[PDB]
Amino acid sequence: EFQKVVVIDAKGHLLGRLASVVAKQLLGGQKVVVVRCEELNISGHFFRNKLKYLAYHFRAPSRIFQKAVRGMLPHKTARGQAALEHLQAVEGIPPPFDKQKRVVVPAALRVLRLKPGRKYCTVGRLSSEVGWKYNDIVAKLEERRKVKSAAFYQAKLAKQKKIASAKEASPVNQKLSQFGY
């Protein structure tokens, strides 16, 4: 299934694997928005990736994730230039996308790709000492949004419980249960 707008949560996702699936999707004429890019993960411990950046200048993981894709797409080709603008990488979950579903990519999930006991690095933690100086405010927004979202979930859960009780109380439900519904 593909949509005109797709929101992908970057928490617990490998950078390269996430970059690959979005690179193909972007060439497919699809708009993809990436949120919480600061919580991306890269195989290899913290010092190695720190040395990698020291050899390498954009401090935003949203820019870094965009930069990784930029060299992973035909940038010279005008088609690649057009597809670049269809990708929107932002840190955290902004209000224009907080009230929308956030899907995940199985091919990039750390739990499905990383062996237990393997060291890994977090981009937001990595970027904190390279020029980024907004971790507190970015974090502060995260708990504020999730607290509001959790309250929304509780209201939705209560509504789901009420309708579920109403659904079971409905005699119509088991009239034609032979269809598996």
């Binding site: 299934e1 699809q30 088609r79």
Partner: protein, 106 residues
Amino acid sequence: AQGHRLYVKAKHLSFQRSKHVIHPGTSIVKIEGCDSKEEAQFYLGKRVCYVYKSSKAVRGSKIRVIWGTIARPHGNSGAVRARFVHNLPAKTFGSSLRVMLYPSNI
């Protein structure tokens, strides 16, 4: 506006090509819900179409359609090879192609 859509959405990926040589006679189409070569057998023979609009009002309408036909599968991920009456423009990469259900074999 629930209803209509007697076809299946599909995306026009690219042409049949080597690493550097492209043959634009046939184009790769990725149909939704098709994810294996054995599955693409069902869509072999269907009539695919490209639908686009233009400023000129021809016959009182504003729609131009380039018909086509699915021919063979392409790889293990459900892609297909479709030949059109007019070869698709190279700009329509990553667009929508409407795979209607005829000629039906079911």
